[PDB]
Symmetry: D2
């Protein structure tokens, strides 16, 4: 089984002004991550990919392009989760047939599902696809907060490999490491990569790695090497850039910094604001000069 540890960018997608996928740009974002950011893999179709604003056919298109462009150069995880479990199975099977290395699914959201319902959800996607599974936990958007005993129940299925922890509860993260030492953890908060790596997370899945991939690998590797002082300096610089990106508008600022690298990262998909304002373009240029030149 292809190794899933390390540094994975959460793949941003380039959209045309009309909301349709810009394939040429998306291939450029992919090439930049693989060739310039030097990531170990791509995490395709997650919240960062503007996934939940798209139809099933568009989701399939993005998975088709990403796999054809990356080929076997890097590891690929397919995020196929959704409120629609039939859609999730459908998408899981499609990515599996394409050769994705592993599936991932957000906890079903909107409705307040019970834990058994969440569990059936994960077990079904695995049983209908035959693929391995990474629980995608992002409580800030889902409102789903699972405790240590519930992760143990999910882990009864041997195809559940671990969790993409897009949450800042570092006690729970240590508890997960203690209770399930053979299960993987990927940090989801780029601006807290140092403290997550201090507790032994196995990798990181991040939206800022599309542009800050060099620094993110250094933080990860220096921290695992016991060079905390060195990692902290690079996490400080990284956070000045992340703070700017958050203040200027996460999605649009990453796409604008990508455009400054010559990648046609396009526009955001509506209902997200699709076009950067003047001021937003100005700020991106400034972040570029200060932190990525």
């Amino acid at each position: 089984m292809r190794d899933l540890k390390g540094i994975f960018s959460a793949l941003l997608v380039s959209f045309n002004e009309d909301g349709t996928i810009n394939e040429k740009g998306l291939r450029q974002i992919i090439r930049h991550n693989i060739d310039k950011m030097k990531v170990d893999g791509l995490y395709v179709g997650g919240s960062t990919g503007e996934n939940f604003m798209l139809s099933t056919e568009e989701k399939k298109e993005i998975f088709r392009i990403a796999k054809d462009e990356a080929k076997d150069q890097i590891a690929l995880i397919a995020q196929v989760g959704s409120v629609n479990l039939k859609e999730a199975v459908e998408l899981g099977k499609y990515a599996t047939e394409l050769g994705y290395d592993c599936l991932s699914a957000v906890t079903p959201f909107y409705y307040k599902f019970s834990f058994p319902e969440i569990k059936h959800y994960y077990d079904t996607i695995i049983a209908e696809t035959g693929s391995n599974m990474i629980v995608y936990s992002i409580p800030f958007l889902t409102g789903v907060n699972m405790g240590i005993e519930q992760f143990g129940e999910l882990y009864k299925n041997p195809k559940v490999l671990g969790v993409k922890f897009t949450a800042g509860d570092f006690y729970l993260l240590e508890r997960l490491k203690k209770a399930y030492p053979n299960h993987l953890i990927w940090a989801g908060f780029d601006e807290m990569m140092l403290p997550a790596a201090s507790l032994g997370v196995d990798g990181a899945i991040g939206s800022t790695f599309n542009v800050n991939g060099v620094r993110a690998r250094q933080i990860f590797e220096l921290t695992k090497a016991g060079k905390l002082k060195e990692a902290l300096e690079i996490q400080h610089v990284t956070n000045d850039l992340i703070e700017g990106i958050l203040a200027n508008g996460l999605y649009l600022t990453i796409k604008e910094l990508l455009k400054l690298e010559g990648v046609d990262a396009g526009y955001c998909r509506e209902p997200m604001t699709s076009k950067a304002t003047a001021e937003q373009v100005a700020k991106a240029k400034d972040l570029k000069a200060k932190f990525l030149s």
Copy 2:
């Protein structure tokens, strides 16, 4: 235009064990609401309809059947919102062509959309379809809370008629009545019908009206006539029933209650637990006996 005030059932949908729509059963639920519950209209494709777990074609299928079964006997409101704005627009056009009386859309969820983007979403649906719109507010599931000034901005669009207020903030409720006297308000919390009718809401859109339509009508009409002691008594009985329904499982218990009236309400759609347990079936029968016999 068709009158949109009064008592509206939020239509539940009958599903087969495999998750496909049971058309025959759905037509039975529809007839029950019109013929026995004596509703003024149906609210199709809401949360209650298990709408966010379905594919776009399934949503069009439910809209088609509901319109074909109901024809022009009662008022029909089509809930077409989603995280996908292109899908909302598609569904909005579809229901418009079918002849629904007005559309409605949940505030875009999952991503934390800004107010301007939420207003754009509503204005886009309106521009693309040409239909009137009822803002669908359900903070408990969406996490979106809008204050009085934001409602005013949404109301600058003359096609916005008002709001389905599925929240229990009665100060905000009075503020809306005070500030926008020409805009309608439909109460969305069945167990708080009396206090909402004491502030003059124009109607009620509710899931328990599928089985407790006679009492709901009474509470609403008795409150408007100033008969608060008589209304409260019926609200008390109604809330014993709702407390039982909520304790036993809202979706499955309304469905099991419909089955005791000989309506083939079927199962719930996965990720929701699809079949009721033996305890759930027994509790429904006991509620049937106690409150709807």
Copy 3:
């Protein structure tokens, strides 16, 4: 025991520039309430009285003054709750000795107390004083939310008379009226008096009744007769006033509105901002001319 239903002003207290109690001003506030606002009673030492920023001796002084000035003109409730249960008991005994008609106690705060702990706290204050008790709900300032079954457990003590309900949950409100018909409810949200009265609350305890008692009484009395539209016109004006009071700073604005009636309501007690700026004073003068002249 004395009748405790009706309109109760949550007594505000007059402080000097240095934070000490201004007795003459406090007596003027009491007199304005009894003689002009025509209240049924006063609720003394509650949050509105700036009670939790004071020492025990100050709370005792306020109790002494208020009983001395009101004599037996109106009903008097004494809020004696605290995080210190020994202080609660001392204050409960003191107000009992003075002739307060009943006590009240906020749910113990700061620490996260269990329900058995909260119930023991109320049972102890009652046992050590021999007085009747009004329990709370106020979750906005305590973060303590109790359910129907927890109120039942508190109501096993025959000296608990009911609850001061300062939380907007009208479902819980109707459930309390259903299960405990002989237990009293006082609404604590002045901007939601109408809908609370619509469900038969027995009275209301509010901070705005120190200046708007006339209207508060009308809303209550009109709602009770089923004259909803007339009550609502008075609730609408009342909420324009309240909206203005809330935006300008609640405590200082009610005190500035009292000063415009010739009542020396003085300053607020630090940590709260003690002095109203020039813009706050002007806004209160405007509110007085528009709504209280």
Copy 4:
């Protein structure tokens, strides 16, 4: 100026059955911390000391005893915060008079104070005592969250030394280190010591150091030496112990664990449940056996 970095136990207080202070037991808790736990200091009068359920004279007693028993053997911080700002100044001056090294104050709670009000509160305690101050973050009990800009304003006063950070926001933690490099940060989450130490916190104030002082020092210093794998092993044993402590009831379990060391840590002060049950006692003895023997 005495060095305030390192390991501080948040001092538990021994109470008699009647809620009064057990002086003899309190001196024994102090002696165990200093001589066996080998702390660098004690944090006296904080939430862990049950301070908020006590009278002003009891707080004073505890400061007197603590200083008399510890003398100048270790650093001593006095927590003097309260909803009552006059009480905060009185305690601040008393502890300054006793020769405490630095003061601390929780953010004023119960009412929702504004930032200027909180800053005024801190600036008043400092002006009135002449002592240094450690501010708080602590959102779980107070509900007050503050950002870099506001810490900036607090830090304009040169007598503010830094912050006792008791909520786990590691992004805010790094940003604080970045913006204000010379300002100190004491971690307040014993179960997240490792990640806090990886970001360079200056020390830790913890309730569990009263019994697990030795492992707390090792985590802190190994982490600072970049020996993360060894650090993590001790954090994992520590967290098994804290998980057990938390499940059994924090305050009572640390006191029963001290009793097993020959310390008369006595009872909790009402409203907290004052005496441990047979099951709580037995679980403490089991935790002692597995983790502290």
